[PDB]
Amino acid sequence: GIPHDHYEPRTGIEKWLHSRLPIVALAYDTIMIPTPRNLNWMWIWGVVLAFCLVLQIVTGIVLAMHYTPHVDLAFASVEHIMRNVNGGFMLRYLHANGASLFFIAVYLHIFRGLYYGSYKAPREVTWIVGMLIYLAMMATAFMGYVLPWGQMSFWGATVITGLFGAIPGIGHSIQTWLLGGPAVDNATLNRFFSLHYLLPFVIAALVAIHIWAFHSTGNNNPTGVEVRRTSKAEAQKDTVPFWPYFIIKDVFALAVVLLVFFAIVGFMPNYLGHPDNYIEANPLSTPAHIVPEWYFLPFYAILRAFTADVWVVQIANFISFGIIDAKFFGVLAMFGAILVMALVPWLDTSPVRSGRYRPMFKIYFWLLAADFVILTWVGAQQTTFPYDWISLIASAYWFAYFLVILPILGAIEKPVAPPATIEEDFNAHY
Amino acid sequence: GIPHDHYEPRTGIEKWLHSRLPIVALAYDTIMIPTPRNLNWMWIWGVVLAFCLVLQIVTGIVLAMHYTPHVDLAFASVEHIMRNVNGGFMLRYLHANGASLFFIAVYLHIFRGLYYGSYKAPREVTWIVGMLIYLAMMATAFMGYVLPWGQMSFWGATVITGLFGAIPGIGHSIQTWLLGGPAVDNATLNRFFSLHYLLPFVIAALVAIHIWAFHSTGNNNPTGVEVRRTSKAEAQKDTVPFWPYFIIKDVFALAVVLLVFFAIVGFMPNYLGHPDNYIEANPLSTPAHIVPEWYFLPFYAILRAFTADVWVVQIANFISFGIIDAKFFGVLAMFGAILVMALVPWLDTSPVRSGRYRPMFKIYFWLLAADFVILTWVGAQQTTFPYDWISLIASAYWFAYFLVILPILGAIEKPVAPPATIEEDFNAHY
Amino acid sequence: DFLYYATAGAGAVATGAAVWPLINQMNPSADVQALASIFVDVSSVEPGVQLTVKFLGKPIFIRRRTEADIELGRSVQLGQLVDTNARNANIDAGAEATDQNRTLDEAGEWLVMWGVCTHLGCVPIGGVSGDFGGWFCPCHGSHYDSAGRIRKGPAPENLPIPLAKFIDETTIQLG
Amino acid sequence: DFLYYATAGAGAVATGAAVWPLINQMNPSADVQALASIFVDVSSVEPGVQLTVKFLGKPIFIRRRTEADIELGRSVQLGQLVDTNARNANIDAGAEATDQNRTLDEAGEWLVMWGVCTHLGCVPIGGVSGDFGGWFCPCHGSHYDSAGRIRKGPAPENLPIPLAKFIDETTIQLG
Amino acid sequence: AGGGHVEDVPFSFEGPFGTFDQHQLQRGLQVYTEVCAACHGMKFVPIRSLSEPGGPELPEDQVRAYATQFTVTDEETGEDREGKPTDHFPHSALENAPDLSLMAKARAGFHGPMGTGISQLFNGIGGPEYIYSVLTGFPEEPPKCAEGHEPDGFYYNRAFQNGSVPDTCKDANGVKTTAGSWIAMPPPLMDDLVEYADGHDASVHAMAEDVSAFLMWAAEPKLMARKQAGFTAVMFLTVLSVLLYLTNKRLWAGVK
Amino acid sequence: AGGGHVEDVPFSFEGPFGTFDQHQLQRGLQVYTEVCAACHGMKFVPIRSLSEPGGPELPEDQVRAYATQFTVTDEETGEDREGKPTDHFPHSALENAPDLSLMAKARAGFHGPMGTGISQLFNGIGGPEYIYSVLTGFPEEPPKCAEGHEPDGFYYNRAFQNGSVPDTCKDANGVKTTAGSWIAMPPPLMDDLVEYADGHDASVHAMAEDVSAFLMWAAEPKLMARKQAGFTAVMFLTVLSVLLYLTNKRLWAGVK
Numbered sequence A, B: 001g002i003p004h005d006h007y008e009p010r011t012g013i014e015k016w017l018h019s020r021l022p023i024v025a026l027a028y029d030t031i032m033i034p035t036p037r038n039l040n041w042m043w044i045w046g047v048v049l050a051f052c053l054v055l056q057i058v059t060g061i062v063l064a065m066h067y068t069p070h071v072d073l074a075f076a077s078v079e080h081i082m083r084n085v086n087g088g089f090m091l092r093y094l095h096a097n098g099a100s101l102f103f104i105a106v107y108l109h110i111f112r113g114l115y116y117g118s119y120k121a122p123r124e125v126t127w128i129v130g131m132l133i134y135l136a137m138m139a140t141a142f143m144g145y146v147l148p149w150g151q152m153s154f155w156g157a158t159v160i161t162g163l164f165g166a167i168p169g170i171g172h173s174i175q176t177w178l179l180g181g182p183a184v185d186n187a188t189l190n191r192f193f194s195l196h197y198l199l200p201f202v203i204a205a206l207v208a209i210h211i212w213a214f215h216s217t218g219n220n221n222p223t224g225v226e227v228r229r230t231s232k233a234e235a236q237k238d239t240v241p242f243w244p245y246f247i248i249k250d251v252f253a254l255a256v257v258l259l260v261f262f263a264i265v266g267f268m269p270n271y272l273g274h275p276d277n278y279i280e281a282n283p284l285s286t287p288a289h290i291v292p293e294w295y296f297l298p299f300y301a302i303l304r305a306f307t308a309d310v311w312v313v314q315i316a317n318f319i320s321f322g323i324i325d326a327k328f329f330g331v332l333a334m335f336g337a338i339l340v341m342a343l344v345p346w347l348d349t350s351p352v353r354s355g356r357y358r359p360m361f362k363i364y365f366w367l368l369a370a371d372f373v374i375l376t377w378v379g380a381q382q383t384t385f386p387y388d389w390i391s392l393i394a395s396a397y398w399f400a401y402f403l404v405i406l407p408i409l410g411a412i413e414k415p416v417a418p419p420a421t422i423e424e425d426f427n428a429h430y
Numbered sequence C, D: 001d002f003l004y005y006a007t008a009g010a011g012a013v014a015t016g017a018a019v020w021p022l023i024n025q026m027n028p029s030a031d032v033q034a035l036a037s038i039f040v041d042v043s044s045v046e047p048g049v050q051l052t053v054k055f056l057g058k059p060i061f062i063r064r065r066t067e068a069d070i071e072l073g074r075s076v077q078l079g080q081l082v083d084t085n086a087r088n089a090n091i092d093a094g095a096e097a098t099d100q101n102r103t104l105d106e107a108g109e110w111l112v113m114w115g116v117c118t119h120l121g122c123v124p125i126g127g128v129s130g131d132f133g134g135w136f137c138p139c140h141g142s143h144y145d146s147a148g149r150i151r152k153g154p155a156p157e158n159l160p161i162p163l164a165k166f167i168d169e170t171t172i173q174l175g
Numbered sequence E, F: 001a002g003g004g005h006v007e008d009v010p011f012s013f014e015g016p017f018g019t020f021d022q023h024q025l026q027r028g029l030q031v032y033t034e035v036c037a038a039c040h041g042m043k044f045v046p047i048r049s050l051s052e053p054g055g056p057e058l059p060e061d062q063v064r065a066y067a068t069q070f071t072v073t074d075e076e077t078g079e080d081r082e083g084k085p086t087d088h089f090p091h092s093a094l095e096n097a098p099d100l101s102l103m104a105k106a107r108a109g110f111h112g113p114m115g116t117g118i119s120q121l122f123n124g125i126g127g128p129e130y131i132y133s134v135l136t137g138f139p140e141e142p143p144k145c146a147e148g149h150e151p152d153g154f155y156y157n158r159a160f161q162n163g164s165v166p167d168t169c170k171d172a173n174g175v176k177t178t179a180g181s182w183i184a185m186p187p188p189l190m191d192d193l194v195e196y197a198d199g200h201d202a203s204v205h206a207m208a209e210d211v212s213a214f215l216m217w218a219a220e221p222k223l224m225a226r227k228q229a230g231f232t233a234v235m236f237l238t239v240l241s242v243l244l245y246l247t248n249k250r251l252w253a254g255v256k
């Protein structure tokens, strides 16, 4: 709702079209939205996520023209792609590393939103639409990893599908319904492949609402001071149009990101992978170490940190009359990490927007960023000492940030005066 | 662009939501558009096409959870669905007959648009978006028929892919590129399955623009008299809101349509099918009769009507110095039927909108409707006498309607005075 | 008012009638339900001969123990075993790992158990092998006795016993 | 002005470099390209013995004609044939259907042709069959002579001859 | 090719309320096991379906013993073994004997009148009725035009259309003057070739009807389940249509 | 289990500008065919790829004659025949001998330091360098703790980690005190076990290096093509990044 200028049909072809379908108008008002002119480099990841979703669908559709979702043929069809399909070896590594590029982007995209308070009002709907995209992404990549049908494909699916069996009462039915049988088998691979095709289109729809969301309220900025929308002469001082100023700024940053991503795919495409996935699926041979991909490690650490001898786990099992066993507690704690992150608009009671002007919050944020790396690290470690304690301290601070610290901080925070306008902050730098 | 009343947030949750993402507003203004109150039963087929697209995607996704796109397993996985998957026999017939229900709907949807002049201005963009949907539908259904990998699946794909070889010069490269090899084989089945998943989502996007198109200009009516857009008090006399008046009228008509469709799927699900497709794909045994499904028959008749001894064909081969042989002529004539139907806004030069008030046009239209049925009938007949002549007169009249008759009629037609307003025609009926 | 409520309920019932087949389709197929149990014809199985059978993707061992194999089984005390649980679905879970509880018949002649090593799921070699006259796992070196109980190796627990019973004089119903 | 145009041109080149791999992936795989031609070892093929080989999905017959089979081939006149076209890709399309043009060598000893009936694509039975000392199609009753030319049946044309040649004294390269 | 004549059998499964006769499918199973199985197979039919509902409905122990007569190569081991109900019927023993899993839906008995599909609309596809016309369509002697010109190893059949015909029987433009054509299948049915348990009629006509009914169930085991689903969808949609009609009327009553 | 030590071999294919040594891949092919093939197989490698570019690059006639030594069951006929280039290498003749198609990508040579991934970042996964350490990791005598307690049918190897260990060599809590463990593979390489045409060095270390390089190509035939594509994408994106930088600078120059 920022004062800009409407689209005017210019030539004759535009007047003929605007009076039937104003699509050239929706493209002008969208690509000419007033964007704050103080945006730093942390506002590029939306475009990198946009590029990623197109990359995964394009290479995804191509790889489906040569993949066979069947246990007897899946592993071979992927090596058929590597060895025989023209450039098929590059298309897999683009699709495989592409998920890592797609998942490192959201975490910088998200931790951007956690620092600068882009989740706080009026931007709750952008966050909730964001969280749903986050769930579809993880469910999509999880089912995608099953498709090569290696060891990690089979046994990763065997562990995670078993967590649904730990639900009280209805857990066995949901596991049977999911697997289509007593265990991970061909029906699981057959249905996981179909849903792996579907959900990226569902994600594409959510990105449309995601983009409709922040266009309604306007882009946040490092100061947290909204754009002045009382006069066109004022808004022009706080903002510049999207095209060409930030289009070229994002497309520039995308080129640098791809310059790294292609160097990874071009020279170390297997660094971010598990060698066990080049071993065919063996139901009669468990690997030595069942490690998810790096973008799932912090939720894997929270799952295994809550063993049966943890004090909080024993208290729950006693209170719940045996309903909440040690395994189901880990399930709640694993998905609970998502939920507290989704409720962070209603847990952060501070009226201050950006974390730039919150001294005490700034400490706890950077500990969360460090804590996320630690959770990602212990996820690959064993359950032995001292890693069982490192994950338990780390899992604890994750929930303490959202459920305890952020509500308490809203009462005792001693903020700092933000600038009066975006213009002040932009001129303070230059 | 009809005068209606804006959406007002009512409860507290609506004010909280409308000030962030006005999705409840876009849903209210859309479902409350002023629609003419004189619409007859031929305006239901748009909604029947909407239900069909959902049915094919829903049952499509389910069938993909149990189908194997591989030559050795495709035919068996489909009989696995018939015999073992819970309700899989009903889901296939819903998907198979659903395409026939999906294709009988467009032809009534289309011949509606040809009679009432819904293709003429300002509705050109709605038509072109309509035609693109028609191509994705046919390309989608064609590739879907390959997936059971029966006799008709293999040999139907063998004939149609061969038409691309008839293009001068570049024809062999496009056929090799399409097939992925010297002939229809597993690579063809593998890629057709991927594109069969993609195009229904692409069709869904085109329907979004399709619905944005007629909402911009407004729905046509049997009279061709546009809604009066000078005052809200006038529009209310010519129109009624979509919800609940026409929603219940269309959902009523859908229930009647499904009452027929489910009886077909429930008691004669194979009447609209070819028995040869229950025979596995045999490259060493051509069937006696390669028949496409009924919704492709009229274009199949136009293809075979132009043999090498047709006078128009011999003239073309002589003029073109042998470039346009008998085969490539049939290809142009088969796709040319689509093109002339797409250009019908620019071939009908009459300024009159509806065909209800064009006496001489009314004869040539109903001859086209009979001509369409005749093309659908001769498409399954042999090339022997007299069917070679019946299809040739029928193929001739198809192009004469669009290229010759309709342009000439615009100059010499003696129309009839339409009503002054939609209000007059609505009270004239009751 | 009845009409506007009956029309809504009939539509919701129709919606529910259309949604439930879309859920139940993902339940196990008719062919997977048919592999829930199998029937073995042990009419031509003499003592000492092992009979390996496929069940739920993995193998099951059905060995008719001889006079010597049963002697070593009943001689072991409960304190000498690494795992004192029988790991049998038929009897209660709290049953002890006695040789009389590791078989179906009171004579202890028929031994039915999962041929799946509890360490990581390998198939031990049968036909009197190892250092205890039983089964030997070649993946990491797990030794089992004649009764199918772990005595040495990384294997934590004993080999589980499925739900098995004799439907007649010469047929066993697994699962 | 060069910068704003070079930046656009460099972007279009990158787009085109990314689009062409997305097209060429649908071209025939490396395993299909390897079946574009094959090599047959005819070292142990005596006269009268037929050798069926798979090529492009369909079978090809490679029969070393005997002294009697070659006699009947060269005795037939051009007017007695139903189809006077040789149907050979090596020589020109306008070549006549003489027995000397239906073989690779001047001696007319080796006959190579598609083992696919031109009627509807069935596999005729070989080993001297039919009413002309050649091949007989059991699908509808198409009779072929010793030279592989149609003489009786629904088959319109003769059996096509692929692009074949002798690379050495005892190897033929088809395609 | 085209479509000739066939014997219209009043099968029980025909019509909206049609259901398979359980005893008839048991007889046709016996006729399949003792006659057609020698050359033909049913690679897509699981043996366990003989105890499934809406079919022969045998006890599982009979099907368990029935499956043992077949020899099956184990998918894992590779050594032969006795067949289980979990296995499918064997492939066709004879090479050019087509599989009979889906034969009752892979052949059309009724066509025409003029490629208009009016016959199949009121008579159905005619699959199980066409098989009946092939088995009982082996005459004593061939036609008059074919005397002394039958292809060796083939047999004339009235219903079979996709077979060869001697030149003596063709017209001036290749069309055959015979009703059917020559099939590679010898006449498989003979009077009283099977002795039923309940002493039922075992004539060639009775066996061809029973085995035809069995072959329909083999192609569609879920025929009876489908017609109940079809009937149910009609009941929901008929009521909902009547309610939606009156609702549309009262709702539009304040306009017209 | 965990990750032990390995010999860091200066393979030619390592590094951005690394390429396979053609003669080396030819030597390892000879060592595979004459030594490793007795137990191992390469079910995913097509034989025709021996003449593919970026590899051994043999003439097609040699690969044609090389493929004849294998006995292959025809996919259609079922009878055995001489192998063509179109066929893959056979499965492992020995059951518990794992397939070697992707062994150079299915095993990691470098791990650590502390699960931080710093070693693989600068040293790579270490697949072909770990295989070299298994072949050349068979010592003369076992460790001191294992004298007279080796499991029968197994052999000690320094690099192998996923093998059994006697109780005499384990610590108080099950962990092994040996560098490696006991592998079921006998030491396959012996000095001068293969006679190369050009008299190249055929020591156990030289053969283990060459066959490791060959086994890398078997897992990734398209290594050299990938690094050209990677280098090319870097050049396009470096120029486009620099142009997009300057464009972004001039474009924002009318604001700052």
Ligand code: HEC
Pocket: F031, F032, F035, F036, F037, F038, F039, F040, F094, F096, F097, F098, F103, F107, F131, F134, F135, F160, F163, F182, F183, F184, F185, F186, F188, F189, F211
């Ligand atoms: C039988 C006489 C063998 C010959 C000759 C070769 N290999 Fe082998 N190999 C064999 C077995 C039975 C095993 C399994 C060992 C176990 O304990 O499970 C192996 C294993 C390998 C491996 C995998 C090691 C691992 O970490 O899992 C490799 C990389 C390997 N062998 C390499 C190899 C090479 C290069 C050979 C030719 C020089 C060779 N082996 C010969 C059996 C036999």
Ligand code: HEM
Pocket: A042, A043, A044, A045, A046, A047, A049, A050, A053, A106, A109, A110, A113, A118, A119, A123, A126, A127, A129, A130, A131, A133, A134, A207, A210, A214, A217, A218, A219, A220, A221
């Ligand atoms: C494919 C997935 C995604 C795409 C394509 C995407 C795209 C974008 C874009 C283009 C923007 C505009 C400003 C910017 O670039 O930051 C944006 C903003 C934002 N996104 Fe996302 N995003 C995705 C995922 C997510 C996720 C997973 C979350 C949170 C869980 C999220 C939450 C937000 C928030 C809070 C903003 C700030 C909006 C504002 O400032 O008004 N997004 N996103």
Ligand code: HEM
Pocket: A053, A056, A057, A058, A059, A060, A061, A062, A063, A064, A067, A078, A091, A092, A095, A096, A099, A102, A137, A140, A141, A142, A144, A145, A146, A147, A148, A196, A197, A200, A201
């Ligand atoms: C949009 C986000 C997507 C994500 C996050 C994703 C994720 C993944 C991952 C992690 C893998 C495993 C790759 C490997 O290790 O080999 C995979 C494989 C696969 N994906 Fe996707 N994918 C996406 C889109 C798609 C789409 C739209 C398709 C549609 C056809 C698709 C089809 C496939 C196929 C066929 C495979 C198996 C082949 C292979 O592994 O290369 N993917 N996916």
Ligand code: HEM
Pocket: B042, B043, B044, B045, B046, B047, B049, B050, B053, B106, B109, B110, B113, B118, B119, B123, B126, B127, B129, B130, B131, B133, B134, B203, B207, B210, B214, B217, B218, B219, B220, B221
């Ligand atoms: C998935 C396929 C389609 C869907 C779901 C769809 C949907 C609709 C709907 C709901 C309407 C308004 C109600 C009505 O007219 O009955 C409409 C109108 C129309 N559609 Fe379609 N349609 C489809 C395909 C097509 C095709 C194939 C064409 C032409 C080749 C076409 C051209 C038109 C035209 C001319 C109108 C009238 C526009 C107006 O009255 O302003 N549509 N469509």
Ligand code: HEM
Pocket: B053, B056, B057, B059, B060, B061, B062, B063, B064, B067, B078, B092, B095, B096, B099, B102, B137, B140, B141, B144, B145, B147, B148, B196, B197, B200, B201, B203
């Ligand atoms: C415009 C939408 C669609 C149309 C017109 C369409 C049409 C068809 C047709 C006519 C068949 C042949 C049916 C048969 O021979 O049994 C078919 C098969 C198939 N289609 Fe679709 N379809 C659509 C959507 C989809 C979607 C979205 C998917 C996947 C998610 C899908 C998956 C399949 C599968 C797996 C088959 C083979 C199994 C079968 O034949 O039932 N369809 N399609």
Ligand SMILES: CO/C=C(/C(=O)OC)c1ccccc1Oc1cc(Oc2ccccc2C#N)ncn1
Pocket: A138, A141, A142, A143, A145, A146, A152, A153, A155, A156, A157, A159, A160, A163, A290, A291, A292, A293, A296, A297, A299, A300, A334, A335, A338
């Ligand atoms: C099919 O298994 C795939 C895996 C993977 O990492 O794919 C990229 C995987 C492999 C080994 C073990 C587990 C694996 O899957 C997963 C999946 C996963 O997804 C979640 C993410 C956040 C919260 C809950 C879950 C779950 N479940 N969190 C952790 N591991």
Ligand SMILES: CO/C=C(/C(=O)OC)c1ccccc1Oc1cc(Oc2ccccc2C#N)ncn1
Pocket: B138, B141, B142, B143, B145, B146, B152, B153, B154, B155, B156, B157, B159, B160, B163, B290, B291, B292, B293, B296, B297, B299, B300, B334, B335, B338
């Ligand atoms: C895979 O073949 C599918 C067919 C089909 O009808 O599917 C529903 C088919 C079967 C037999 C013969 C041909 C078949 O395909 C087709 C496809 C077809 O599509 C077109 C429709 C209009 C204009 C041009 C084409 C083409 N090509 N027009 C006619 N036959």
Ligand SMILES: CCCCCCCCO[C@@H]1O[C@H](CO)[C@@H](O)[C@H](O)[C@H]1O
Pocket: B260, B263, B264, B267, B268, E013, E014, E015, E016, E017, E018, E120, E121, E122, E123, E124, E125
């Ligand atoms: C056009 C609307 C048709 C309504 C359904 C008519 C159903 C009658 O149709 C008949 O159904 C029988 C069911 O077994 C089948 O045996 C017949 O083959 C079929 O023609």
Ligand SMILES: CCCCCCCCO[C@@H]1O[C@H](CO)[C@@H](O)[C@H](O)[C@H]1O
Pocket: A260, A263, A264, A267, A268, F013, F014, F015, F016, F018, F121, F122, F123, F124, F125
């Ligand atoms: C972190 C991004 C750095 C740019 C990519 C350079 C990666 C070079 O990394 C090298 O790649 C070689 C190519 O095969 C491997 O052989 C080496 O093992 C690896 O170290």
Ligand code: FES
Pocket: C117, C118, C119, C120, C121, C122, C123, C137, C139, C140, C141, C142, C153, C154, C155
């Ligand atoms: S797997 Fe059985 S002992 Fe290691």
Ligand code: FES
Pocket: D117, D118, D119, D120, D121, D122, D123, D137, D139, D140, D141, D142, D153, D154, D155
């Ligand atoms: S198919 Fe060869 S003659 Fe009919």
Ligand SMILES: [Sr+2]
Pocket: A309
């Ligand atoms: Sr304790």
Ligand SMILES: [Sr+2]
Pocket: E008, E009, E010, E011, E014, E129
């Ligand atoms: Sr009848």
Ligand SMILES: [Sr+2]
Pocket: F008, F009, F010, F011, F014, F129
């Ligand atoms: Sr190195």
